[PDB]
Amino acid sequence: ETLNGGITDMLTELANFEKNVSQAIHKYNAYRKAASVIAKYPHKIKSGAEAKKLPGVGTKIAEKIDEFLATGKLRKLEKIRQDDTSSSINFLTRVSGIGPSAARKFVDEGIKTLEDLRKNEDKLNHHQRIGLKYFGDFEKRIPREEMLQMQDIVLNEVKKVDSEYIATVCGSFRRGAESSGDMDVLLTHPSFTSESTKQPKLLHQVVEQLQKVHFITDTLSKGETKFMGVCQLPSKNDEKEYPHRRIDIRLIPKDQYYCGVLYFTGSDIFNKNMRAHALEKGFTINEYTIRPLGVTGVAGEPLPVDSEKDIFDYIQWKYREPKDRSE
DNA sequence: CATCTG
DNA sequence: CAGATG
Length: 327
Ligand code: NA
Ligand code: NA
What we know:
monomer, alpha+beta, DNA polymerase, domain 1, Beta Polymerase, domain 2, 4 domains, five-stranded mixed sheet, two-stranded antiparallel sheet, 15 helices, 9 strands, binds sodium ion, DNA-binding
């Protein structure tokens, strides 16, 4: 956790690069286990060979740890951190919409900067365009003081279109967090579930309302159960308009809300622990359900949940207010 | 994983 | 349809 930190970091830099710049998914994946393992390793890695000793740890990495241990740096790391091409690729990727794949193409075409991109808005697709449009806004965190206002709007409008809708804002916003990255809404209706054959309108109706009043301003992607957009809190009395924020809305069958709700609320660590304990108590959990574990190895069957409570209960545990869902 | 693009 | 992005 700090004993082998640099090593784990340098490896992460390397891993990252394999995958992003080169296309070395193999290698990329290589650095990953490696860091994962040295990550757990209880002692102070004093050398290559010592490391090699571990699994995932081959000769080449060993080589690497050596240099880095021997001198405060790595040539390869040093060489990559310069290389304009590599840098471009890490940068373009910042744009919502450009993945690495794209980043390569553009660079090989000479697009390497923000301006580059504007000049060539023709080559970017819609998502990518919105992305470029709101680069800044997009990178800005979201303060809860704003989140609360957003939440206020969305919930009220869903209310109006249908009294029967159930919306919940998950994320860290939910776990207490002072600021967040994007707004994430979980949505269900009574009339939609596991079996119920669809109802797209269930989602599209709400999306519209939200644009009806202008809360939503753009659509990144809109399907029948998941919507990816851009919203914005009405600029008050002109002088201070707000940054544009990423937002998602997704339809969930009422019969799998809470697990999803639970699940999205996180944090990752909370999940895991809860997941393992579930396992203990003779259970299973994933994003949509909790099932009684058979002894034959495993087994299924959907346990029936009416709130985050039914879940906890199930695995017989202390109901956890979202704030204390941390670890 | 669900959506888009081409 | 494969293959990209979030
Ligand atoms: Na991106
Ligand atoms: Na293939």
